[PDB]
Design an enzyme around this catalytic site. Structure first.
Site, mmCIF file in Angstrom:
data_model
loop_
_atom_site.group_PDB
_atom_site.id
_atom_site.type_symbol
_atom_site.label_atom_id
_atom_site.label_comp_id
_atom_site.label_asym_id
_atom_site.label_seq_id
_atom_site.Cartn_x
_atom_site.Cartn_y
_atom_site.Cartn_z
ATOM 1 C CD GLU A 191 -1.726 -2.196 1.400
ATOM 2 O OE1 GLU A 191 -0.720 -2.626 1.919
ATOM 3 O OE2 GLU A 191 -2.588 -3.179 1.632
ATOM 4 C CE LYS A 210 -17.524 -6.551 3.967
ATOM 5 N NZ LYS A 210 -17.011 -7.590 4.257
ATOM 6 C CG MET A 246 23.563 3.169 4.178
ATOM 7 S SD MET A 246 21.740 2.908 4.574
ATOM 8 C CE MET A 246 22.017 1.689 5.839
ATOM 9 C CG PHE A 251 -9.710 -9.311 11.358
ATOM 10 C CD1 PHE A 251 -8.498 -9.526 11.658
ATOM 11 C CD2 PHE A 251 -9.951 -9.355 10.078
ATOM 12 C CE1 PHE A 251 -7.701 -10.094 10.679
ATOM 13 C CE2 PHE A 251 -9.286 -9.919 9.158
ATOM 14 C CZ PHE A 251 -7.838 -10.478 9.535
ATOM 15 C CD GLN A 252 -7.603 -6.937 7.809
ATOM 16 O OE1 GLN A 252 -6.418 -7.150 7.598
ATOM 17 N NE2 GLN A 252 -8.498 -6.898 7.046
HETATM 18 C C1 LIG Z 1 -12.249 -15.025 9.685
HETATM 19 C C2 LIG Z 1 -11.386 -15.343 10.753
HETATM 20 C C3 LIG Z 1 -11.543 -16.733 11.407
HETATM 21 C C4 LIG Z 1 -10.852 -16.893 12.572
HETATM 22 N N1 LIG Z 1 -11.202 -18.190 13.309
HETATM 23 C C5 LIG Z 1 -10.425 -18.386 14.440
HETATM 24 C C6 LIG Z 1 -10.770 -19.857 15.203
HETATM 25 O O1 LIG Z 1 -11.617 -20.561 14.632
HETATM 26 N N2 LIG Z 1 -10.217 -19.874 16.335
HETATM 27 C C7 LIG Z 1 -9.587 -19.156 16.828
HETATM 28 O O2 LIG Z 1 -9.056 -19.415 18.259
HETATM 29 N N3 LIG Z 1 -9.198 -17.805 16.246
HETATM 30 C C8 LIG Z 1 -9.810 -17.385 15.075
HETATM 31 N N4 LIG Z 1 -9.450 -16.395 14.594
HETATM 32 C C9 LIG Z 1 -8.830 -15.325 15.223
HETATM 33 C C10 LIG Z 1 -9.588 -14.756 16.148
HETATM 34 O O3 LIG Z 1 -10.382 -13.645 15.684
HETATM 35 C C11 LIG Z 1 -8.625 -14.111 17.348
HETATM 36 O O4 LIG Z 1 -7.641 -13.511 16.742
HETATM 37 C C12 LIG Z 1 -7.949 -14.903 18.273
HETATM 38 O O5 LIG Z 1 -8.970 -16.173 18.457
HETATM 39 C C13 LIG Z 1 -7.539 -14.494 19.683
HETATM 40 O O6 LIG Z 1 -6.758 -15.092 20.349
HETATM 41 P P1 LIG Z 1 -6.368 -14.995 21.718
HETATM 42 O O7 LIG Z 1 -7.711 -14.434 22.504
HETATM 43 O O8 LIG Z 1 -5.698 -16.214 22.288
HETATM 44 O O9 LIG Z 1 -5.375 -13.945 21.951
HETATM 45 P P2 LIG Z 1 -5.779 -12.432 22.363
HETATM 46 O O10 LIG Z 1 -6.724 -11.603 21.496
HETATM 47 O O11 LIG Z 1 -4.515 -11.637 22.594
HETATM 48 O O12 LIG Z 1 -6.556 -12.299 23.883
HETATM 49 C C14 LIG Z 1 -5.748 -12.629 25.212
HETATM 50 C C15 LIG Z 1 -6.273 -12.458 26.120
HETATM 51 O O13 LIG Z 1 -5.643 -12.712 27.665
HETATM 52 C C16 LIG Z 1 -5.176 -11.602 28.241
HETATM 53 N N5 LIG Z 1 -3.875 -11.532 28.644
HETATM 54 C C17 LIG Z 1 -2.898 -11.272 28.008
HETATM 55 N N6 LIG Z 1 -1.780 -11.660 29.027
HETATM 56 C C18 LIG Z 1 -2.379 -12.189 29.931
HETATM 57 C C19 LIG Z 1 -1.689 -12.748 31.179
HETATM 58 N N7 LIG Z 1 -0.220 -12.790 31.493
HETATM 59 N N8 LIG Z 1 -2.417 -13.440 32.279
HETATM 60 C C20 LIG Z 1 -3.755 -13.322 32.026
HETATM 61 N N9 LIG Z 1 -4.354 -12.847 30.839
HETATM 62 C C21 LIG Z 1 -3.811 -12.468 29.985
HETATM 63 C C22 LIG Z 1 -5.432 -10.183 27.269
HETATM 64 O O14 LIG Z 1 -5.886 -9.331 28.038
HETATM 65 C C23 LIG Z 1 -6.396 -10.906 26.285
HETATM 66 O O15 LIG Z 1 -7.609 -10.543 26.823
HETATM 67 C C24 LIG Z 1 -10.101 -15.926 13.323
HETATM 68 C C25 LIG Z 1 -9.873 -14.629 12.590
HETATM 69 C C26 LIG Z 1 -10.531 -14.257 11.319
HETATM 70 C C27 LIG Z 1 -10.445 -12.952 10.770
HETATM 71 C C1 LIG Z 2 19.188 12.271 4.389
HETATM 72 C C2 LIG Z 2 18.504 11.063 5.126
HETATM 73 O O1 LIG Z 2 17.500 11.243 5.991
HETATM 74 C C3 LIG Z 2 18.808 9.740 4.686
HETATM 75 S S1 LIG Z 2 19.893 9.070 3.645
HETATM 76 C C4 LIG Z 2 19.921 7.764 4.021
HETATM 77 C C5 LIG Z 2 20.842 6.947 2.977
HETATM 78 C C6 LIG Z 2 20.679 6.863 1.728
HETATM 79 O O2 LIG Z 2 21.399 5.571 0.879
HETATM 80 P P1 LIG Z 2 21.163 5.826 -0.704
HETATM 81 O O3 LIG Z 2 22.111 4.618 -1.267
HETATM 82 O O4 LIG Z 2 20.162 5.724 -1.059
HETATM 83 O O5 LIG Z 2 21.762 7.117 -1.290
HETATM 84 P P2 LIG Z 2 23.416 7.519 -1.557
HETATM 85 O O6 LIG Z 2 23.593 8.427 -0.408
HETATM 86 O O7 LIG Z 2 23.307 8.282 -2.488
HETATM 87 O O8 LIG Z 2 24.117 6.310 -1.135
HETATM 88 C C7 LIG Z 2 19.507 7.308 5.020
HETATM 89 C C8 LIG Z 2 19.460 5.921 5.887
HETATM 90 N N1 LIG Z 2 18.637 8.407 5.558
HETATM 91 C C9 LIG Z 2 17.603 8.405 6.530
HETATM 92 C C10 LIG Z 2 16.446 7.727 6.376
HETATM 93 C C11 LIG Z 2 16.169 6.481 7.002
HETATM 94 N N2 LIG Z 2 14.828 5.765 6.562
HETATM 95 C C12 LIG Z 2 13.947 6.364 5.787
HETATM 96 C C13 LIG Z 2 12.564 5.587 5.458
HETATM 97 N N3 LIG Z 2 14.298 7.559 5.162
HETATM 98 C C14 LIG Z 2 15.329 7.943 5.564
HETATM 99 N N4 LIG Z 2 15.652 9.422 4.720
HETATM 100 C C1 LIG Z 3 -1.537 -4.857 4.028
HETATM 101 C C2 LIG Z 3 -2.953 -5.909 3.758
HETATM 102 N N1 LIG Z 3 -3.606 -5.323 2.720
HETATM 103 C C3 LIG Z 3 -4.678 -6.221 2.511
HETATM 104 C C4 LIG Z 3 -5.081 -7.190 3.351
HETATM 105 C C5 LIG Z 3 -6.476 -8.026 3.113
HETATM 106 N N2 LIG Z 3 -6.219 -9.390 2.642
HETATM 107 C C6 LIG Z 3 -6.561 -10.328 3.617
HETATM 108 S S1 LIG Z 3 -5.854 -11.849 3.023
HETATM 109 C C7 LIG Z 3 -5.503 -11.109 1.364
HETATM 110 C C8 LIG Z 3 -4.910 -11.875 0.022
HETATM 111 C C9 LIG Z 3 -3.687 -12.562 0.689
HETATM 112 O O1 LIG Z 3 -3.738 -13.711 -0.344
HETATM 113 P P1 LIG Z 3 -2.266 -14.488 -0.012
HETATM 114 O O2 LIG Z 3 -1.098 -13.744 0.590
HETATM 115 O O3 LIG Z 3 -1.491 -15.145 -1.473
HETATM 116 O O4 LIG Z 3 -2.636 -15.760 0.881
HETATM 117 P P2 LIG Z 3 -3.687 -16.458 0.338
HETATM 118 O O5 LIG Z 3 -5.136 -16.280 0.749
HETATM 119 O O6 LIG Z 3 -3.637 -16.796 -1.079
HETATM 120 O O7 LIG Z 3 -3.455 -18.414 0.923
HETATM 121 C C10 LIG Z 3 -5.747 -9.521 1.355
HETATM 122 C C11 LIG Z 3 -5.704 -8.824 0.278
HETATM 123 C C12 LIG Z 3 -4.509 -7.293 4.523
HETATM 124 N N3 LIG Z 3 -4.581 -8.438 5.384
HETATM 125 N N4 LIG Z 3 -3.170 -6.902 4.895
#
Ligand SMILES: Cc1cc2nc3c(=O)[nH]c(=O)nc-3n(C[C@H](O)[C@H](O)[C@H](O)COP(=O)(O)OP(=O)(O)OC[C@H]3O[C@@H](n4cnc5c(N)ncnc54)[C@H](O)[C@@H]3O)c2cc1C
Ligand SMILES: CC(=O)c1sc(CCOP(=O)(O)OP(=O)(O)O)c(C)[n+]1Cc1cnc(C)nc1N
Ligand SMILES: Cc1ncc(C[n+]2csc(CCOP(=O)(O)OP(=O)(O)O)c2C)c(N)n1
Ligand SMILES: Cc1cc2nc3c(=O)[nH]c(=O)nc-3n(C[C@H](O)[C@H](O)[C@H](O)COP(=O)(O)OP(=O)(O)OC[C@H]3O[C@@H](n4cnc5c(N)ncnc54)[C@H](O)[C@@H]3O)c2cc1C
Ligand SMILES: [K+]
Ligand SMILES: [K+]
Ligand SMILES: [Mg+2]
Ligand SMILES: [Mg+2]
Lengths: 538, 558
Positions: free
Chosen positions: B56, B168, B495, B118-119
C-alpha cells in the site's frame, strides 16, 4: 533523595546502552538516520548488542515482533525521525492488536526545532497514540533512564504491547552533568485471593470441565508448564485459540486442538457440552464463540443451577465481563494465579465418561478437505501436513511464521503444534508481509531452531525485500510460498530467480511426485532457502 | 434542491459515480475485506485505470508521483487496518511537500467501531497530524458530501493529503433517501473589501520592484501549483530583467538555459545563488517557505537585503497562499496573500519594463568564474563519478527530444540529480523534500508515468533507497509503465558517517544482484562497472522499450 552519579560524564547514547544492558537487551532491530545517530552509533559500535538491519523500517518492526514472540523478551526497535518513525506505524499497530511487548525508540529533531516543520520531523507521539499502550518524548538527558525504564515496564506488564519513546537529537547527544535520583535508573487483593479459592471450588465441583486457553498463558515462562500441570492434576481437556497454539502439546490425549469457527468439531462440541469453562488468557473472540447467546449452553445452565459456568483468568480488568458474563473472574497474571490455585485443586484420577464422549467425537468429526487425486494440482493443506511431519522428524525445535490469507488458517489447522512460542502469526491486525521479517526475528531469538515461514504469494510480495536481510543477518530461515495463481490478477516475480538474486537457494515444486523430496531438501538445506509450491486454487 | 440521481445505488456505485464528477481517471490501490464494496465497483469499471502495487505504501507514493506530474490529485484506495497504516508514510510525505492526495480507507462496520475488531485501526486519529483534514463517513447519505469536501480541501490553499474513512456497512448500503443537491455537486466571486485588500499589497510591492536596484526572484513549489505559474514567472523575469533562483522543489519552474537563471540555492545550491541573495536588496519570495537548509542560521542570510529594510531600499516581498506561513520564519516587509500565479498576473501591468541592470549582471554574471559546481572529474582507469553519470544521462535523455520526468530516492544521489541535471520544464523534478522518504523514487516514477504516458520517466535512485520499495518492480511491469530505473550503487562506503576530515563511514547493507533482480521481476537489467562502457549503456538504458534497470557502480568516495 538517594542520588546517582554513575552516568555523569556520559552521553545519552552511552546512557542508552547501559540502560539496554540493565533491561537484559542484547538484540536491537533498526535503521539509521541523522536524528537517531547519537543512539545508533552507540548501539552499532558496541559488541554487547546484535544490531539487525532490515531494508525497510517496517521489516525492523516485524522482526522485533517475531523476536518477542519467539523469546518472550521485548522487541527493541531503533529508527530515525519522520519517515523512519512513520514506517513502523504498521508493526506498532500490529503488536498493539496482538499484545506483543515492543519498545520503539524514534530519533527526533532537536527540542529547539519541535513544531517548526523542520526537515523530517513528525508528530510521532500524536501519530502513534492509538497504536501504543503509552508513548513519550524525552525532554532532557536527566530524564532518559526514567523514560526507558517506564517504557520497558509498561511494555512487559498487564497485557503486553508496544510503547514509543521519542528521542530528540540534542537530548541523546548531550552529556549528563547532573546527578539523578537512583530509583529512576533501576528497572521495575484479598478479593483476588478469594476469587482463586472460589475458582478452585468450581473446578473441583465440575464433571465436564474444559480449559480454554489463549495467548495470555504465553506471557510467562512457566505458563504452559502450569497449564499442563493443572490439566494432568484435574484431568481437564484443553482447547486453544489460534494465538494459543503451542501452549499445549496437541499429541497429548487431553488436547482438543483449536477451538472455534475453523477449529476441530470435537473442541467446539466439548465447549458446548461443558458444565465449566476455564478461560485462561483468552479474549472470547466471536470467531471463537460464534453467536454469543448460543455459546456454552451447558455452562450457562450450570451457572443458572449454581454448579458451574465460566471462570476467566484475565490480566486486564476492562476485558472482564466485556463479552461473556463470568461467574468468577481471577484478575492478574494467569500463570501467577494458576500457581497459587494449584495446591487447592483436587487431584482427579479419571473422567472416563467425559473423555469417552470426547474420543467418540474425535472419531466422528476429524478435519476434512478435498484431498489430492492422481494428476491433480497439489493441495495446500497436504503440503502443510507433510511439512509438519518432515519438520518434526528433524528432531529440531521448530518455529513457524505465516503471512495473512488462507495459508494462515491452514497452517493453524493442519500443522501439529507441540511447543510454546512456535506459532508466530498476525491475528489481530492481519498484516500481510508479516511472515518473512517475523521469521528473521524469530531466528535471531532462537539461532538453533528451524524457522519456517508458511507464506502466500500476495503476502510475501509485500515485504520480499527482506530476503537479503535474512542473508546479511545469517538467519537460515526456510521460506515456503504456497502459490495459488472477474478476479484480481497480480503479476508475481519468478520467486526462484528472486531468491537467487537475493543470495538464497531457490526451490520449486509443480507436481505431486516431486513434493516429498523437495520438502526434505528444503528443511535439510543449510542457509536460507525459498521453496515455491504451485498449488490448487480454492 | 434535492438530488435523487443516487437513490437505489450502493455506496460503492455512488463512490464510482463521484470519482467521475471529480474528473478522476486513475486510482491507486490494494483490495481488502473492508473496502470490498468500493473496490468491486471501481476495479471492473473502464472509467478508471486502477493501478495495483504490491504494498500500500507503493500506492501512496504512486499517487504522489501522479499528482506532481499531472497537477491532479492522487487518489488512493486501501483497506482497513494494515492497509491504512501502510499509507501513513506517503500521507506524511504528501503533507510535508504540499501534495494533493485523497486517501480512501476501508473500515470495519460502524457497529464494530471500538470493539477491537479484526483489522480495526483508529485511522482518523493516526492520520490527524499528517492530513489537512479527515473524516469517517457514518451513512451512505453522507458519502458524496465527504468526497466533495475531500477533493476541495486537498486542492485548496496549500494542497495536501486528506483521508476519508469508509465503514463497510456504509459502502455496502443502498441509498434510499434523496439528499441535498448542495452535497452532491463539487465546488468565484470576491468582495470589494477583499479585492482592495489584495490589490493594495500588490501595488505596494509593484512599485517596490519598480524601484529595482538589486532584485532577485526566490521561487519555490508554489509557482507550480498553477498551470500559468512558470509562464507568468518567465515574462516577469523578462519585463524587469529579474534573475531567478529556485528551491529544490522549484526546479523546473524556470529554464536553466536562460542567462537569467541562478539555478538552485541553499546549503547544496550553486554558489552564484546563495551569494546573490546577499548582494540583493529586494528578495521577491514566490511560493517558497524559507527552509532550514535554504536559510542558514537566520541571523546571517540575508543581511544586505535586510539593509533595505532600514533604508526603504527594498527588502522581502512574500507571495504566499497561507497567511499562517507569513513571518513565521523570516520577517517580511510586504506580504501578498493568495495564489502566487494569480497575484503575479494582477501585478504584471504595474511593472516598469526595465531592460538593463548590468551592474547586477556582473557581480553575479562573473561569479562563476569563481565557484561553479566543482567536483573531482574522473581520470582514465579510475572509478565512475556519480555527477558524471547524471551529467551524461541528462544529455542522452535530452537528445531524444522527449518530455523528461525525473524522480529520485533520498541521499547524496538526490542532491547530485538536483545539481547536475539541467532543468527546463515545470513538473519534471519529483523528489521527496520535506520528509525525505527513502523508497520514493520507484513508485513515484510509476505514478508519474501513468500521469504522463508519453514522457520519458527516469528514477535516479540510491542503492539503500531503492531497497526500501523494490517490490514495486513487478508493479511497473504489470502496469506497463516503461520507467527507467537508475541505481547509483556506492555500497562500498557505509550509510553512516562516523567522522571526517576538515576538507570514514560504517553500516553497509548487503545488496541483492540488481540485474538478476530486474530479470526475476520481468524487466531488462543493465550494469556498468567501467568508464568505457558507460556511454553505450546509458544510451541503451534510455533507448530500451519497456521498463529497464541500470546499475552503475560508482565512487564510494564522493
Ligand atoms: C475469519 C477469521 C477466522 C478466525 N477463526 C478463528 C478460530 O477458529 N479459532 C481461534 O482461536 N481464532 C480465530 N481467528 C482469530 C480470532 O479472531 C482472534 O484473533 C484470536 O482467537 C484471539 O486469540 P487470543 O484470544 O488467544 O489472543 P488475544 O486476543 O491476545 O487475547 C488474550 C487475552 O488474554 C489476556 N492476557 C494477556 N496476557 C495475560 C496474562 N499474562 N494473564 C492473563 N491474561 C492475559 C489479554 O488481555 C487478552 O484478553 C479468526 C480470525 C478471522 C479473521
Ligand atoms: C538524508 C537522510 O535522512 C537519509 S539518507 C540515507 C541513506 C541513503 O542511501 P542511498 O544509497 O539510497 O543514497 P546515497 O546517499 O546516494 O548512497 C538514510 C539511511 N537516511 C535516513 C532515512 C532512513 N529511513 C528512511 C525511510 N528515510 C530516510 N531518509
Ligand atoms: C496489508 C494488507 N492489505 C490487504 C489485506 C487484505 N487481505 C487479507 S488476505 C488477502 C489476500 C492474501 O492472499 P495471499 O497472501 O496470497 O494468501 P492466500 O489467501 O492466497 O493463501 C488480502 C488482500 C491485508 N490483510 N493486509
Ligand atoms: C537531503 C536534502 C537536502 C536538502 N537541501 C536543500 C538545499 O540545499 N536547497 C533547497 O532549496 N532545498 C533543500 N532541501 C529541501 C528542503 O527540505 C525543502 O523541502 C525545500 O527547501 C522547500 O522548498 P519549497 O519552499 O519551494 O517548497 P515547500 O516546502 O512546499 O513550500 C512552498 C511554499 O509556498 C506556498 N505555496 C504553496 N502553493 C502556493 C500557491 N499556489 N501560491 C502561493 N503560495 C503557495 C506554501 O504554502 C509554502 O509556504 C533538501 C532536502 C533534502 C531531502
Ligand atoms: K492441528
Ligand atoms: K543544474
Ligand atoms: Mg495466494
Ligand atoms: Mg548509496
Amino acid at each position: 533523595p538517594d542520588m546517582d552519579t554513575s552516568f555523569v560524564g556520559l552521553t545519552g547514547g552511552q546512557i542508552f546502552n547501559e540502560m539496554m544492558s540493565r533491561q537484559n537487551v542484547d538484540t536491537v532491530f533498526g535503521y539509521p538516520g541523522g536524528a537517531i545517530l547519537p543512539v545508533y552509533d552507540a548501539i552499532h559500535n558496541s559488541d554487547k548488542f546484535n544490531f539487525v538491519l532490515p531494508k525497510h523500517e517496517q521489516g525492523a518492526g516485524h522482526m522485533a515482533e517475531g523476536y518477542a514472540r519467539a523469546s518472550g523478551k521485548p522487541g527493541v526497535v531503533l529508527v530515525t525521525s519522520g519517515p523512519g518513525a512513520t514506517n513502523v506505524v504498521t508493526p506498532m499497530a500490529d503488536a498493539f492488536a496482538d499484545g506483543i511487548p515492543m519498545v520503539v525508540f524514534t530519533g527526533q529533531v532537536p527540542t529547539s526545532a519541535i513544531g517548526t516543520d523542520a526537515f523530517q520531523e513528525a508528530d510521532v507521539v500524536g501519530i502513534s497514540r492509538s497504536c501504543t499502550k503509552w508513548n513519550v518524548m524525552v525532554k532532557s538527558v536527566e530524564e532518559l533512564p526514567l523514560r526507558i525504564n517506564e517504557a520497558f515496564e509498561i511494555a512487559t506488564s498487564g497485557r503486553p504491547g508496544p510503547v514509543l519513546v521519542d528521542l530528540p537529537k540534542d537530548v541523546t547527544a548531550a552529556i549528563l552533568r547532573n546527578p539523578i535520583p537512583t530509583k529512576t535508573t533501576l528497572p521495575s487483593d484479598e478479593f483476588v485471593m478469594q476469587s482463586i479459592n472460589k475458582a478452585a471450588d468450581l473446578i473441583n465441583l465440575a464433571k465436564k470441565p474444559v480449559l480454554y486457553v489463549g495467548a495470555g498463558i504465553l506471557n510467562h515462562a512457566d505458563g504452559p508448564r502450569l497449564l499442563k500441570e493443572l490439566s494432568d492434576r484435574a484431568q481437564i481437556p484443553v482447547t486453544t485459540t489460534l494465538q494459543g497454539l503451542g501452549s499445549f502439546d496437541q499429541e497429548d490425549p487431553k488436547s482438543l486442538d483449536m477451538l472455534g469457527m475453523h477449529g476441530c468439531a470435537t473442541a467446539n462440541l466439548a465447549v458446548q457440552n461443558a458444565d465449566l469453562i476455564i478461560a485462561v488468557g483468552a479474549r472470547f473472540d466471536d470467531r471463537v464463540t460464534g453467536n454469543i447467546s448460543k455459546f456454552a449452553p451447558e455452562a450457562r445452565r450450570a451457572a443458572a443451577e449454581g454448579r458451574g459456568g465460566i471462570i476467566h483468568f484475565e490480566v486486564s480488568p476492562k476485558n472482564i465481563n466485556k463479552v461473556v458474563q463470568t461467574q468468577i473472574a481471577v484478575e492478574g497474571d494467569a500463570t501467577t494465579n494458576l500457581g497459587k490455585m494449584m495446591s487447592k485443586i483436587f487431584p482427579v484420577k479419571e473422567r472416563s465418561e467425559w473423555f469417552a464422549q470426547i474420543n467418540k467425537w474425535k472419531k466422528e468429526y476429524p478435519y476434512a478437505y478435498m484431498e489430492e487425486t492422481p494428476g491433480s494440482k497439489i493441495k495446500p493443506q497436504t503440503v502443510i501436513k507433510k511439512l509438519s511431519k518432515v519438520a518434526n522428524d528433524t528432531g529440531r525445535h521448530v518455529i513457524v511464521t505465516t503471512g495473512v490469507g488462507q495459508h494462515q488458517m491452514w497452517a493453524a489447522q493442519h500443522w501439529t503444534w507441540r511447543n510454546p512460542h512456535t506459532f508466530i502469526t498476525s491475528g489481530g491486525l492481519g498484516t500481510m508481509g508479516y511472515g518473512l521479517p517475523a521469521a528473521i526475528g524469530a531466528q535471531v531469538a532462537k539461532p538453533e531452531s528451524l524457522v519456517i515461514d508458511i507464506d502466500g504469494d500476495a503476502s510475501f510480495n509485500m515485504t520480499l525485500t527482506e530476503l537479503s536481510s535474512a542473508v546479511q543477518a545469517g538467519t537460515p530461515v526456510k521460506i515456503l510460498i504456497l502459490n495459488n495463481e472477474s478476479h484480481t490478477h497480480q503479476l508475481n516475480p519468478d520467486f526462484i530467480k528472486l531468491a537467487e538474486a537475493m543470495g538464497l537457494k531457490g526451490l520449486r515444486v509443480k507436481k505431486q511426485e516431486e513434493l516429498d523430496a523437495k520438502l526434505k531438501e528444503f528443511v535439510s538445506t543449510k542457509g536460507p532457502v525459498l521453496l515455491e509450491v504451485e498449488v490448487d486454487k480454492k
